[PDB]
Amino acid sequence: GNTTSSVILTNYMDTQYYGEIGIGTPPQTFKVVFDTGSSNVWVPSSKCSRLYTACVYHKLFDASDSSSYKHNGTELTLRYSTGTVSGFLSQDIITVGGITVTQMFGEVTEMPALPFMLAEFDGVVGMGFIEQAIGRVTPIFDNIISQGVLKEDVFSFYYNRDSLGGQIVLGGSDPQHYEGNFHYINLIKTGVWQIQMKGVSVGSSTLLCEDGCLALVDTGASYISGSTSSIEKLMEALGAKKRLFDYVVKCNEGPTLPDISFHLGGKEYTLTSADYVFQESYSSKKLCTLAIHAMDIPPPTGPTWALGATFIRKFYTEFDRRNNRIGFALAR
Numbered sequence: 134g135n136t137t138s139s140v141i142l143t144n145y146m147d148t149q150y151y152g153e154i155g156i157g158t159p160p161q162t163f164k165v166v167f168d169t170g171s172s173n174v175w176v177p178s179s180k181c182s183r184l185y186t187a188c189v190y191h192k193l194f195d196a197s198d199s200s201s202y203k204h205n206g207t208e209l210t211l212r213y214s215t216g217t218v219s220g221f222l223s224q225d226i227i228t229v230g231g232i233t234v235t236q237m238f239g240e241v242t243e244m245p246a247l248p249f250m251l252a253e254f255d256g257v258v259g260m261g262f263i264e265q266a267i268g269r270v271t272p273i274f275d276n277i278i279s280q281g282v283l284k285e286d287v288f289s290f291y292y293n294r295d296s297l298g299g300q301i302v303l304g305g306s307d308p309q310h311y312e313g314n315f316h317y318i319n320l321i322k323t324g325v326w327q328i329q330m331k332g333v334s335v336g337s338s339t340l341l342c343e344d345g346c347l348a349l350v351d352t353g354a355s356y357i358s359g360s361t362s363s364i365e366k367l368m369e370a371l372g373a374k375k376r377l378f379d380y381v382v383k384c385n386e387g388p389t390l391p392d393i394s395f396h397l398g399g400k401e402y403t404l405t406s407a408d409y410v411f412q413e414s415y416s417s418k419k420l421c422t423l424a425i426h427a428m429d430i431p432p433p434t435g436p437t438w439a440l441g442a443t444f445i446r447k448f449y450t451e452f453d454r455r456n457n458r459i460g461f462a463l464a465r
């Protein structure tokens with residue numbers, strides 16, 4: 134086709150970027166993360182027991198208020214690295230950036246308070262491949278492609294550093310939010326937004342991923358992550374202290390921290406301390422969190438690094454389904 138369309142995103146505290154979709158007739162609105170690290174659509178269900186407090190606080194899809202609903206009822210569980218939701222499949226019309234698509238999605242009936250009470254978003258729109266889709270449910274971008282409306286089989290992510298929170302372009306990219314040329318890196322394989330990485334360096338020292346490793350480009354993740362052993366080494370190099378869920382440095386040390394570079398497609402993608410430290414103070418008596426942590430992702434996807442919002446804030450990212458590649462450009 135000829136259409137480009139966009140979804141405007143909100144940036145909650147540089148950690149959660151979400152847009153709004155409509156589901157049903159008339160449209161029920163949900164806040165959703167657009168997640169290249171997964172392939173299912175879900176939102177919380179009116180069938181969710183209210184003993185799940187996360188279903189009390191989030192927007193619930195009520196099938197009984199939608200005239201375009203089509204029951205399916207197959208039960209599915211989506212296991213994320215951060216937690217699990219379960220429920221059942223339904224079909225309805227989803228509106229996303231003014232594109233209406235008939236989509237099979239999860240109605241979540243089991244939604245654990247940890248972590249989902251910490252989600253500003255209600256649900257997830259998986260932007261990954263059908264190969265990753267639980268229940269082999271056709272992902273929404275595949276269904277959008279099938280309509281022949283988009284000028285290209287691509288979508289692009291801008292995540293703002295100011296917390297316009299962000300923008301996803303369906304069918305292209307937005308030159309207003311990047312500059313210079315795209316650097317295009319081929320996927321290891323179709324089915325996952327994962328590329329080869331050939332080094333993680335602290336300063337001039339390539340102390341990790343020397344023999345090569347994987348990098349998942351995960352728009353649904355807040356941080357940069359790697360395996361526990363990888364991240365422990367990295368954090369030992371930075372002089373960072375491990376806590377339960379994050380690593381920290383004394384805030385005064387934040388600006389002294391070295392650059393971290395990811396060797397992707399023959400180039401060094403470099404984050405400075407400003408890109409990865411939540412510099413909330415300059416006090417030697419406060420602790421400042423790093424936007425880098427351990428996520429152990431089991432095979433076949435992992436072990437793998439994952440380049441989340443921390444990375445994407447700096448690097449405008451085009452996801453190219455036509456050519457099975459990811460393009461990076463400098464975000465502005």
Ligand SMILES: COCCCCn1c(C(=O)N(CC(C)C)[C@@H]2CNC[C@H](C(=O)N3CCOCC3)C2)nc2ccccc21
Nearest residue numbers: 149150166170213214215248251252352353354355434442
């Ligand atoms: C950039 O803005 C969105 C940041 C959301 C970060 N966040 C995650 C989170 O990081 N994820 C899930 C979620 C999308 C459901 C990621 C999304 N990408 C897929 C990964 C994942 O499960 N894997 C395992 C399989 O391989 C790919 C990475 C989980 N869980 C959360 C719970 C409460 C609050 C915030 C949470």
Ligand SMILES: *[C@@H]1O[C@H](CO)[C@@H](O)[C@H](O)[C@H]1NC(C)=O
Nearest residue numbers: 203204205206207222237268
């Ligand atoms: C749910 O979807 C599957 C796959 O399309 C289909 O075979 C099945 O019959 C559906 N079930 C119901 C109850 O509609």
